[PDB]
Amino acid sequence: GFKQDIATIRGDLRTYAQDIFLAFLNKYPDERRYFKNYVGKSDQELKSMAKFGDHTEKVFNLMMEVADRATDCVPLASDANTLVQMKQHSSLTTGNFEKLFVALVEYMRASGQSFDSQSWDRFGKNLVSALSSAGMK
Numbered sequence: 001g002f003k004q005d006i007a008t009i010r011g012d013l014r015t016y017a018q019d020i021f022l023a024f025l026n027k028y029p030d031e032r033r034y035f036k037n038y039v040g041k042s043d044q045e046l047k048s049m050a051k052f053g054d055h056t057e058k059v060f061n062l063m064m065e066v067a068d069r070a071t072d073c074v075p076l077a078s079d080a081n082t083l084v085q086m087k088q089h090s091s092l093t094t095g096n097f098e099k100l101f102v103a104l105v106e107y108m109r110a111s112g113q114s115f116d117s118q119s120w121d122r123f124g125k126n127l128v129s130a131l132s133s134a135g136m137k
């Protein structure tokens with residue numbers, strides 16, 4: 001289930017974080033514009049670079065904190081607020097997050113592992129609703 005998936009992801013956080021983030025950028029290439037220092041780099045280039053790994057791991061760490069604090073895939077209002085009020089997220093709309101979660105769910109569906117992809121789809125939908133509520137356009 002969802003709790004197990006959090007454990008799975010945390011167990012190899014840097015690998016999943018990189019793989020899912022790359023799946024996101026490659027499926028939605030226009031999104032790479034928010035990441036000016038990743039423009040013009042292959043997947044293996046980016047994997048070579050500690051800063052790419054560091055960024056992505058920090059993102060997914062927080063994502064797993066928010067997921068673990070959720071009840072039945074419903075995130076806390078407070079966690080939504082953190083994500084909306086972070087300086088780094090000042091130019092984002094809910095669609096940016098929507099894209100990330102579609103990529104994550106598609107990754108899970110493609111993985112051949114028994115991820116609870118339906119729960120991640122719901123968690124993403126709930127988080128998007130909560131960001132919108134916290135003031136995100």
Ligand code: HEM
Nearest residue numbers: 031034035054055058059060062063088089092096097100
């Ligand atoms: C649940 C989803 C997300 C979480 C948990 C999250 C979390 C974070 C965290 C923790 C940082 C700071 C990382 C660091 O210090 O290295 C960060 C930075 C950032 N995030 Fe997000 N993020 C999310 C979604 C997104 C999406 C969808 C976008 C854009 C499509 C985005 C764009 C950025 C950018 C541009 C930065 C700054 C890049 C940098 O200077 O390192 N985030 N995010």
